[PDB]
Amino acid sequence: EIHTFDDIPMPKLADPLLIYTPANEIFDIASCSAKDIGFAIAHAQIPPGGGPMPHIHYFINEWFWTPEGGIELFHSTKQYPNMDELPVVGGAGRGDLYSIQSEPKQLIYSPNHYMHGFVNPTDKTLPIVFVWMRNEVAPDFPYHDGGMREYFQAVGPRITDLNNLPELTNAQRAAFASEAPKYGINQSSYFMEYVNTISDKLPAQIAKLKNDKDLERMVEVIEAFNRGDKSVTCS
Amino acid sequence: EIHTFDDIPMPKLADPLLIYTPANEIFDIASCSAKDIGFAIAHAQIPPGGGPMPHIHYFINEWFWTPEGGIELFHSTKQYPNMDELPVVGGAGRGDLYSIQSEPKQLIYSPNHYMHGFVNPTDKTLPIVFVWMRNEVAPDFPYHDGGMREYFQAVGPRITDLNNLPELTNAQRAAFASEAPKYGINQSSYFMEYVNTISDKLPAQIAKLKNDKDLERMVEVIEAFNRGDKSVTCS
Ligand SMILES: [Cl-]
Ligand SMILES: [Cl-]
Ligand SMILES: [Cu+2]
Ligand SMILES: [Cu+2]
Ligand SMILES: [Cu+2]
Ligand SMILES: [Cu+2]
């Protein structure tokens, strides 16, 4: 059974940060913080075939929200609490992944240390929204968001015109993987690097992952920011 | 149980055709024909992470020979006899793949219509040898080999210096997928395009695939060519 969510609004910044990530994702991204919480959020468009290779977070917890479904996510049952141990053939070993064919407005919650990724397997561009919440061990980044917006900003070209995207380069793709550990991500550079099997039978243990409480709080922050409330910041 | 083979020699051409394929493979490639048979052969080096996305052949039967193992192959049980039907989410449906952790000198045989691919999942460059034999429905290509050398030559940059490789480009990667049908290949442009599941339990039906008779014949052709025999041609 799926977990759903009705609305995750976007912080409306004066000059929107639009980034074409080296995973082939069109991001409208921002960071927000409040006294109690810090996070990055992106409303994204995923072209056919787009999406990041399997990766693991150490500084954030992630939410995926798929307003139109279509997106296929991949998720482990196994957790990788040690950033020093890559799940690779020569070391800690590659992991098993389970796929999720997302449904309209499905909300998927993925705590730090789980391996995940996703792809647009369809022939049309699909929307997706991410929230990356700063966890309790994350270092303080300039935007106090746990590091994710700084990551994308550092590795992906900035977009001017959505109808004339930057050409992603080899260096950008390599940097997307190699710069990732400084932002608390172990990011694979090809699909099967960290991967042993992909299975379509979803374990209940993954399906049940949920953190609505933190998400509703961050929505409050976003909506307050959009109302002009000065006790929160988004930029 | 694995099928092994001791030696697949390379046709020694005056000026070797070295191609850096857009799948990140370093090819030393040639075509050979004789009265009875026609084929392309490549001795290749696969950098970490290199290898083609899942694809299906219509003009050739393929052999993979892994002198040092390490290479991980992916192979279906299902066959796709209709080139007009792509195994995609909007159409004929994505297929199940089974992985093979190759062993030194293992020989894997893959008849037309099967879906396959492979990757170097290790942190070192690994050798691999391919033979693509012209089947009975293949159109006549300029080298009478069933189309594969013409394909790689058309879509991949030619190498000058193995220590200073060409930079693969976006257009080359796109062309590797989009030009493929003219060479009798349905080639996916990302790993999960044609793929539903990847499983590590190999069905006996795939393991048993074998065509040593045709391979030994093509080795004869190669060895004759290298002895200067004029009744066969390699170039
Ligand atoms: Cl492994
Ligand atoms: Cl499907
Ligand atoms: Cu629920
Ligand atoms: Cu993530
Ligand atoms: Cu055998
Ligand atoms: Cu092939």
Return the residue matching tokens 């109302």: A227
Pairing of strands A60-66, A195-199: unpaired
**Bridge partners (DSSP) listed for residue A24:** none
- Which tokens is B35 given? 């009265």
Is B202 in the A-facing interface, judged by CB distances under 8 Å? Answer: no
SS3 B126: strand
> What CATH number is associated with residue B9?
2.60.120.10
From CA A22, how far away is CA A174, in angstroms rounded?
9
**Bridge partners (DSSP) listed for residue B42:** B29, B130
From CA A121, how far away is CA A50, in angstroms rounded?
8
From residue A27, give the alpha-carbon distance in Å to each of A46, A140, A165, A235: 9, 23, 12, 14
Q: What is the amino acid identity at position A2?
A: I
From CA A179, how far away is CA A185, in angstroms rounded?
9
**Bridge partners (DSSP) listed for residue A197:** A96
Minimum distance, in Å, between the CA of residue B22 and any CA atom of chain A? 12
The residue of chain A nearest to residue B168, with distances taken between CA atoms, is A170
Return the residue matching tokens 């012209």: B134
Counting every residue written for chain A, the total comes to 235
Collect all residues with Cβ–Cβ distance below 8 Å to A229 and sequence separation of at least 6: none
Record: contact B123-A90, CB cut-off 8 A: yes
Backbone angles phi, psi at A223, to 5 degrees: -70, -40
Q: Closest to B192 (Cβ–Cβ): which among A72, A189, A196?
A: A72
* HEC-encoded secondary structure of chain A: CCCECCCCCCCCCCCCEEEEECCCEEEEEEEEECCCCEEEEEEEEECCCCCCCCEEECCEEEEEEECCCCCEEEEEEEECCCCCCCCCCCCCCCEEEEEEECCCCEEEEECCCEEEEEECCCCCCEEEEEEEEECCCCCCCCCCCCCHHHHHHHHCCECCECCECCCCCHHHHHHHHHCHHHHCEEECCCHHHCEEEEECCCCHHHHCCCCHHHHHHHHHHHHHHHHCCCCCEEC
How many Cβ atoms are within 10 Å of A90's Cβ, its own excluded? 10
Q: Is A17 left (phi over 0), alpha (psi -120 to 50) or beta?
A: beta
Among B186, B203, B188, B184, residue whose Cα is nearest residue B140? B184
DSSP H helices in chain B: 148-155, 170-178, 204-207, 212-227
Backbone angles phi, psi at B70, to 5 degrees: 80, -45
Q: Closest to B49 (Cβ–Cβ): which among A168, A189, A198?
A: A189
How many Cβ atoms are within 10 Å of A187's Cβ, its own excluded? 24
From CA A92, how far away is CA A102, in angstroms rounded?
30
CA atoms within 13 A on the CB side of A197: 14
Among A59, A37, A16, residue whose Cα is nearest residue A151? A59
From CA A54, how far away is CA A73, in angstroms rounded?
10
From CA A123, how far away is CA A143, in angstroms rounded?
36
Collect all residues with Cβ–Cβ distance below 8 Å to A50 and sequence separation of at least 6: A23, A24, A25, A119, A120
From CA B77, how far away is CA B205, in angstroms rounded?
7
- Which tokens is B159 given? 């190498």
From residue A11, give the alpha-carbon distance in Å to each of A15, A59, A220: 11, 22, 11
Collect all residues with Cβ–Cβ distance below 8 Å to B119 and sequence separation of at least 6: A190, A192, B49, B50, B51, B71, B72, B74
R_g (Cα) of chain B, nearest Å: 17
Record: contact A88-B49, CB cut-off 8 A: no
- Please check if B43 is assigned to a binding site: no
- Helix-strand-coil split of chain B, %, nearest 5: 20, 35, 45
Q: How many domains would you assign to chain A?
A: 1
Return the residue matching tokens 């055709």: B17
**Residues of chain B contacting A122 with CB distance shorter than 8 Å:** 89-90
Minimum distance, in Å, between the CA of residue A40 and any CA atom of chain B? 28
Return the residue matching tokens 């307050």: A224
Among B108, B118, B25, B103, residue whose Cα is nearest residue B70? B103
- Please give the span between the terminal C-alpha atoms of chain A, in angstroms, as a whole number: 36
Q: Closest to A196 (Cβ–Cβ): which among B94, B197, B200?
A: B200
- Which tokens is B211 given? 């065509």
Minimum distance, in Å, between the CA of residue A1 and any CA atom of chain B? 20
**Bridge partners (DSSP) listed for residue B201:** none
Q: Is A89 left (phi over 0), alpha (psi -120 to 50) or beta?
A: alpha
- Show the CA angle centred on residue B72, arms to residues B67 and B73, nearest 5°: 100
Q: How far is the CA of B156 from the centre of ligand 5 (A)?
A: 34
Query: Technique behind this structure?
Result: X-ray
B32 touches B223 (CB < 8 A): no
Q: Which of B123, B190, B194, B199 to mutate against chain A (most A CBs within 10 Å)? A: B190
- Please give the span between the terminal C-alpha atoms of chain B, in angstroms, as a whole number: 36
- Show the CA angle centred on residue B77, arms to residues B76 and B78, nearest 5°: 90
* HEC-encoded secondary structure of A140-186: CCCCCCCCHHHHHHHHCCECCECCECCCCCHHHHHHHHHCHHHHCEE
A77 touches A196 (CB < 8 A): no
Q: Closest to A122 (Cβ–Cβ): which among B89, B168, B170?
A: B89
Record: contact A49-B119, CB cut-off 8 A: no
The residue of chain A nearest to residue B100, with distances taken between CA atoms, is A196
Q: Is A226 exposed, middle or buried (0-12, 13-18, 19+ CB in 10 A)?
A: middle
CA atoms within 13 A on the CB side of A99: 18
From CA B88, how far away is CA B97, in angstroms rounded?
14
Backbone angles phi, psi at A44, to 5 degrees: -125, 155
- Please check if B116 is assigned to a binding site: yes
From CA A166, how far away is CA A149, in angstroms rounded?
18
- DSSP string across B86-120: --STTTT--EEEEEEE--TTEEEEE-TTEEEEEE-
SS3 B208: coil
From CA A1, how far away is CA A88, in angstroms rounded?
32
Q: Which domain holds residue B224?
A: 1-235
User: A148-155 and A170-178 are packed helices; what angle lies between their axes, rounded to 10 degrees?
Assistant: 150
From CA A233, how far away is CA B172, in angstroms rounded?
44
A120 touches A73 (CB < 8 A): no
From CA B134, how far away is CA B62, in angstroms rounded?
9
From residue A182, give the alpha-carbon distance in Å to each of A148, A185, A187, A200, B156: 10, 7, 11, 32, 34
Record: contact B198-A193, CB cut-off 8 A: no
CA atoms within 13 A on the CB side of B217: 12
Among B75, B10, B53, B63, residue whose Cα is nearest residue B234? B10
Q: Is B88 exposed, middle or buried (0-12, 13-18, 19+ CB in 10 A)?
A: middle
Q: Closest to A121 (Cβ–Cβ): which among B122, B170, B192?
A: B192
Q: What is the amino acid identity at position A40?
A: A
Pairing of strands A233-234, A106-110: unpaired
Minimum distance, in Å, between the CA of residue B192 and any CA atom of chain A? 7
Residue ranges of A 56-95 with Cβ closer than 8 A to chain B:
72, 88-90, 94
B13 touches B223 (CB < 8 A): no
- Which tokens is A232 given? 């929160």
Return the residue matching tokens 């879509």: B155
